[PDB]
Write an enzyme that holds these catalytic residues in place. Structure first.
Site, PDB file in Angstrom:
ATOM      1  N   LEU A 292      13.129  25.661  54.812  1.00 13.82           N
ATOM      2  CA  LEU A 292      14.529  25.365  54.154  1.00 13.82           C
ATOM      3  C   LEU A 292      14.443  23.546  54.126  1.00 13.82           C
ATOM      4  CD1 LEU A 292      17.295  27.042  56.600  1.00 13.82           C
ATOM      5  CD2 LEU A 292      16.717  27.431  54.166  1.00 13.82           C
TER       6      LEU A 292
ATOM      7  N   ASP B 173      18.897   6.919  59.947  1.00 14.85           N
ATOM      8  CA  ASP B 173      18.192   7.574  58.859  1.00 14.85           C
ATOM      9  C   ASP B 173      19.474   8.429  57.973  1.00 14.85           C
ATOM     10  OD1 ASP B 173      16.228   8.673  57.208  1.00 14.85           O
ATOM     11  OD2 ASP B 173      15.817  10.278  58.509  1.00 14.85           O
TER      12      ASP B 173
HETATM   13  N1  LIG Z   1      19.821  17.697  57.319  1.00 12.74           N
HETATM   14  C1  LIG Z   1      18.588  17.613  57.057  1.00 12.74           C
HETATM   15  C2  LIG Z   1      17.119  17.443  56.456  1.00 12.74           C
HETATM   16  C3  LIG Z   1      16.240  18.529  57.248  1.00 12.74           C
HETATM   17  C4  LIG Z   1      14.797  18.123  57.220  1.00 12.74           C
HETATM   18  C5  LIG Z   1      14.094  19.140  57.771  1.00 12.74           C
HETATM   19  C6  LIG Z   1      13.585  18.514  59.301  1.00 12.74           C
HETATM   20  C7  LIG Z   1      14.109  16.739  59.036  1.00 12.74           C
HETATM   21  C8  LIG Z   1      14.380  16.678  57.789  1.00 12.74           C
HETATM   22  N2  LIG Z   1      16.877  19.691  56.931  1.00 12.74           N
HETATM   23  C9  LIG Z   1      17.515  20.452  57.641  1.00 12.74           C
HETATM   24  C10 LIG Z   1      17.968  21.545  56.736  1.00 12.74           C
HETATM   25  C11 LIG Z   1      18.991  22.713  57.275  1.00 12.74           C
HETATM   26  N3  LIG Z   1      19.264  23.493  56.045  1.00 12.74           N
HETATM   27  C12 LIG Z   1      20.257  24.478  56.428  1.00 12.74           C
HETATM   28  N4  LIG Z   1      20.358  25.426  55.375  1.00 12.74           N
HETATM   29  C13 LIG Z   1      20.085  25.415  53.847  1.00 12.74           C
HETATM   30  C14 LIG Z   1      19.009  24.689  53.493  1.00 12.74           C
HETATM   31  C15 LIG Z   1      18.405  24.755  52.305  1.00 12.74           C
HETATM   32  C16 LIG Z   1      18.985  25.798  51.352  1.00 12.74           C
HETATM   33  C17 LIG Z   1      18.421  25.826  49.814  1.00 12.74           C
HETATM   34  C18 LIG Z   1      19.793  26.205  49.067  1.00 12.74           C
HETATM   35  C19 LIG Z   1      19.556  27.192  48.144  1.00 12.74           C
HETATM   36  N5  LIG Z   1      18.272  27.222  47.408  1.00 12.74           N
HETATM   37  C20 LIG Z   1      17.385  27.926  48.522  1.00 12.74           C
HETATM   38  C21 LIG Z   1      17.503  27.219  49.820  1.00 12.74           C
HETATM   39  C22 LIG Z   1      19.850  26.695  51.950  1.00 12.74           C
HETATM   40  C23 LIG Z   1      20.358  26.513  53.426  1.00 12.74           C
HETATM   41  N6  LIG Z   1      20.815  24.515  57.618  1.00 12.74           N
HETATM   42  C24 LIG Z   1      20.634  23.800  58.691  1.00 12.74           C
HETATM   43  N7  LIG Z   1      21.060  23.779  59.843  1.00 12.74           N
HETATM   44  C25 LIG Z   1      20.393  22.933  60.653  1.00 12.74           C
HETATM   45  C26 LIG Z   1      19.587  22.045  59.663  1.00 12.74           C
HETATM   46  C27 LIG Z   1      19.775  22.988  58.273  1.00 12.74           C
HETATM   47  C28 LIG Z   1      16.981  21.369  55.727  1.00 12.74           C
HETATM   48  N8  LIG Z   1      16.314  20.243  55.563  1.00 12.74           N
END
Ligand SMILES: N#CC[C@H](C1CCCC1)n1cc(-c2nc(Nc3ccc(C4CCNCC4)cc3)nc3[nH]ccc23)cn1
Length: 289
Positions: free
Chosen positions: A13, A134
């Site tokens: 993600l 951050d």
């Molecule tokens: N903040 C922050 C940044 C952090 C990085 C990773 C480690 C530090 C920095 N990072 C946390 C998440 C994250 N993403 C989700 N969902 C999610 C994410 C992407 C999509 C896309 C949507 C449509 N296209 C296809 C996929 C869909 C759903 N859920 C979460 N829960 C807790 C964290 C988290 C993502 N990057």
């Protein structure tokens, strides 16, 4: 609480610096009924990253707020190696990408709804004496069209009981284009430097992440774009000391830009509080409605 044998990897993600978050299904019954969760792991599980990660997990577990992503548990293997943080999965992903994708559908009143939620989450952090360090739309997540949450706490520190700042410079790359001047010059982080960064977040939102308008792009065009490595930081410092600032984004009202510029005060003590930021944003929201 979570057994790794039951965490089914689905996709990646997001990636940070030395860490990443995966979409998994926690399915202990092995019948495809388990819930989808977000799983954060280290990309390089050294001692100092591991203790930092344990502290980050403790920080997240101590936070309970509508605009802070929910801690669910931890998962480890093999004694205690490969520690993983289990969080709620938020289905719309990061606010950075979401805003860039739906720019035509998201109006100013909705941006201000998100702004207000970010301010309330940050104020809660401050009551715990935590410094986020951050704040940026890439670290804000979207639960639904009406709710965002601060989503990552990998750099968050707890203030010393006797001081109102925390001094830390660790190796790697630092989001210097979101940094308050005193964070650039003296590595000092405080609620007030979080307020400076929040001003950059507000700028980000009102640019709709148009990518020639990013803080790095704007600042690099301002300081001269032949600049070299460390010189960049030096020039950035000089720029901010001479009151060079990110411009008002296209379509941004004057009063919102003024919130930004007040957050970008060189004088650390003159920056607004998160409670005052929330009041002013909510009053503008009410005026617009
Ligand atoms: N903040 C922050 C940044 C952090 C990085 C990773 C480690 C530090 C920095 N990072 C946390 C998440 C994250 N993403 C989700 N969902 C999610 C994410 C992407 C999509 C896309 C949507 C449509 N296209 C296809 C996929 C869909 C759903 N859920 C979460 N829960 C807790 C964290 C988290 C993502 N990057």
């Amino acid at each position: 609480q979570f057994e790794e044998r039951h965490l089914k990897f689905l996709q990646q993600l997001g990636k940070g610096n030395f860490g990443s978050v995966e979409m998994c299904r926690y399915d202990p019954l092995q019948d495809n009924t388990g819930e989808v969760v977000a799983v954060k792991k280290l990309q390089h599980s050294t001692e100092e990253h591991l203790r930092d990660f344990e502290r980050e997990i403790e920080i997240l577990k101590s936070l309970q707020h509508d605009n802070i992503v929910k801690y669910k548990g931890v998962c480890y293997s093999a004694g205690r190696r490969n520690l993983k943080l289990i969080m709620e999965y938020l289905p719309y992903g990061s606010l950075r990408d979401y805003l860039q994708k739906h720019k035509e559908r998201i109006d100013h009143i909705k941006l201000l709804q998100y702004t207000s939620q970010i301010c309330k989450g940050m104020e809660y952090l401050g009551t715990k004496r935590y410094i986020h360090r951050d704040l940026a739309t890439r670290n804000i997540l979207v639960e639904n069209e009406n709710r965002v949450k601060i989503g990552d706490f990998g750099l968050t520190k707890v203030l010393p009981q006797d001081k109102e700042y925390y001094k830390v410079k660790e190796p790697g790359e630092s989001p210097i284009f979101w940094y308050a001047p005193e964070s650039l010059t003296e590595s000092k982080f405080s609620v007030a430097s979080d307020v400076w960064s929040f001003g950059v977040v507000l700028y980000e939102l009102f640019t709709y992440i148009e990518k020639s308008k990013s803080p790095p792009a704007e600042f690099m065009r301002m300081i001269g774009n032949d600049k070299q490595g460390q010189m960049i930081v030096f020039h950035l410092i000089e720029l901010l000391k001479n009151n060079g600032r990110l411009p008002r984004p296209d379509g941004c009202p004057d009063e919102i830009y003024m919130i930004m510029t007040e957050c970008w005060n060189n004088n650390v003590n003159q920056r607004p509080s998160f409670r005052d930021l929330a009041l002013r944003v909510d009053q503008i929201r009410d005026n617009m409605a």
